[PDB]
Structure 1
């Protein structure tokens, strides 16, 4: 029974925490010497692209309120906290010649020491879509392959400064989303894809550059730091369970496996065997870059653990110039015969399907043979309602049930022999939600935008504390 699930259902080394990302929570966008990211420029030059015409300038000010956030995490009582570093905060010109920003570095050391002073293990993510505008304007950010070198300098800087305290690193979080919405749909920064953009090619380049960035940085950590710092490095991928519309149509079973390949295979096959997946080569063909064999040699096996981000699920079936969206040759369906795959959440794109996480997990271990996994994101948003008062606003029953159901399923995947080491809820705080602006609330901690971002736990947080404290 899911409602009874608690810490003692898990092995003792199991890790529990929460998560944020720098641009969604920090604010202090032009403070302490930070330079502009592509999200800074996107939200300020294309306000029409954001619900409310808002931006992350202040966000929820974890830049100035990080001490409260740490006190929150100490009360919450979980093992670990996952956050990301703002590239253009530590290097405002993105590359070394641009300046090294001591104040930015001091911020993260203050963050990291606060966490450890309180027994909370930091899990740090080098990159979460916030590309320094300077690198974007000079050579097209991740379009160009120069990005690998700059990224590598940025990475080395973080390892040298923080690697004595941070022992768990991730190069990238959710690169899929950065590629697709950055360059295919043009909904996220830099906002490209109808030169003005091209959903047929750019996404594939960008992803190509992301993966070399990731593999270069892991070679760096592994050759220069790991022996002396003794940490571990890995990466974090967007996932979504893909169900065959018709369990029978062996052709649907195929539209589903293809939908995987194009989402998760696109990143996981490279770091597994040094190459993209067949289906992708087949359907993309010559628009899809190749790896030199030293590149493959570098990618193949570039990680100590993998993190999976899981929210939702879908039915897949087959489809009927060029674009990533169409290259997949599938159609997405939400119901079989009038029945949705699961109930809606506050967000119409998000259907609740706890069994999906069990599946995605088992699939991953089976298809790619990963020996160590973390779930690095999993959570749900609140129904929008500016009408509720706080005692109402905080009873977040759906989220609570969502957490218990997904955590129960993770536990099942383990029984199936998937070696999962921890689970992190998304997100710690309500925060900036990219194109959605401040309207969507994923926090286990509630935030009051009308009164300096006062923070208050929701019942999910009290429940996490009480059920998983240690």
Structure 2
């Protein structure tokens, strides 16, 4: 029974936590010496692409209110906090020659020491989509292999400044989403793919450079820092459970494995065997870049742990100029005979399917033999409703059930043999949700946008504190 799940159902070294990313919570977008990221430019030049026309200039002001966030985290009682560094805050011009911003280094040091003073372990992600505009404008950012060397200079600065206290690093978070919505759909920054963009080629280049940036930073960590600092490094991937529309149709079973291949396998195979998956080579063909053997040798095994982010699931079937989307040759279905795979959250794409996380975890251990996994993101958004007062708004029983069910399933997956070392809910605070602006709330902590981003715990935060304190 999922309602009685609690810390005592887990081993002693199991880590519970919560998460954010820099651009979604910080604001201070032009404070403290920070330069612009591609998100700054996208939300300012193209406000029509954002619900409400809003941006993250102020967001929820964790740049100034970080002492409050630390205080909330202390009261919450969980082991860990996962956040990311804004690249253009510490390197406003992206590369070392653009100046090193000491004030942005001071921010991250104050945040890290306040977390440590309170017994909270920092898990830090280097990159969460906020490419410095200078690097975008100079040579097209992740479209160019120049990005690998710049990204390494940046990773080295972080290890040097923070590596004495941060022992858990992630190079990238959800690079899938960056690649696809940035370059295939054009819904996210830099907003291309519908030169002006090409959804047939650009996503594949971007992903290819993301993986090389990741591998070069891991080798840098491993050869130059790991012995003096004794930390660990990994990466976090987007996942969505892919279920055969018809359990029996072997054509359907194959469409599902291919959907997995194009989402997860696209990233996971290169760091496992040095190459892209077979299905992708077959359906993408000559548009899919190749690794030199030095690159392959660098990629293979380039991690100490992997993190997975899981929200939802879907049914897959077979499909009947070029585009990443059409290359998959699958169609997505939500119902089996008028019965949805699960109920909607406040977002129509997000269907609640807890068994999804147990399956995605077992699949990953099986298909890739990952020794050590964390669930680095999992969570759900409130029904949109500006008519509720805070007493009502904070009663977030859907989220509370969602968390219980998934955490339960995570337990199950460990009984199935998956070695899962921790779980981070997503996210700590209501914050800026990219295309969806401020309208979609994912936080265990409520934010009052009418009154200086005043923070208040929802029921789920109370529950997490009570069942998982330590």
Q: Which TM bucket (shorter chain)? A: over 0.9
Shift of 1:75: 0.1
* Cα displacement string for residues 405-432 of structure 1 (whole angstroms, at most 9, x for unaligned residues): 0000000000000000000000000000
Equivalent runs, 1:235-246 vs 2, <5 Å: 235-246=235-246
How high is the TM-score relative to the length of structure 2?
1.00
Shift of 1:260: 0.2
Shift of 1:151: 0.0
Alpha-carbon distance in 2 for matches of 1:346, 1:195:
37
Alpha-carbon distance in 1 for matches of 2:321, 2:371:
41
Match of 1:151 in 2: 151
* Cα displacement string for residues 192-236 of structure 1 (whole angstroms, at most 9, x for unaligned residues): 002100000000000000000000000000000000000000000
Shift of 1:175: 0.1
Q: Which runs of 5+ in 1 are unaligned?
A: none
Alpha-carbon distance in 1 for matches of 2:355, 2:250:
21
Secondary structure (helix, strand or coil) at the match of 1:251 reads: helix
* Cα displacement string for residues 234-283 of structure 1 (whole angstroms, at most 9, x for unaligned residues): 00000000000000001100000000000000000000000000000000
Alpha-carbon distance in 2 for matches of 1:194, 1:15:
42
Equivalent runs, 1:70-81 vs 2, <5 Å: 70-81=70-81
Secondary structure (helix, strand or coil) at the match of 1:431 reads: coil
Shift of 1:166: 0.1
Secondary structure (helix, strand or coil) at the match of 1:392 reads: helix
Secondary structure (helix, strand or coil) at the match of 2:412 reads: helix
Secondary structure (helix, strand or coil) at the match of 1:218 reads: helix
* Cα displacement string for residues 374-432 of structure 1 (whole angstroms, at most 9, x for unaligned residues): 00000000000000000000000000000000000000000000000000000000000
Secondary structure (helix, strand or coil) at the match of 1:60 reads: coil
Shift of 1:139: 0.1
How high is the TM-score relative to the length of structure 1?
1.00
Shift of 1:339: 0.2
Alpha-carbon distance in 1 for matches of 2:385, 2:281:
46
Secondary structure (helix, strand or coil) at the match of 1:426 reads: coil
Secondary structure (helix, strand or coil) at the match of 1:23 reads: helix
Shift of 1:101: 0.1
Q: Does 1:347 align with 2:347?
A: yes
Alpha-carbon distance in 1 for matches of 2:7, 2:141:
43
* Cα displacement string for residues 64-96 of structure 1 (whole angstroms, at most 9, x for unaligned residues): 000000000000000000000000000000000
* Cα displacement string for residues 101-150 of structure 1 (whole angstroms, at most 9, x for unaligned residues): 00000000000000000000000000000000000000000000000000
Shift of 1:332: 0.1
Match of 1:330 in 2: 330
* Cα displacement string for residues 148-193 of structure 1 (whole angstroms, at most 9, x for unaligned residues): 0000000000000000000000000000000000000000000000
Q: Extract structure 1 runs of 4+ deviating beyond 3 A.
A: none
Secondary structure (helix, strand or coil) at the match of 2:271 reads: helix
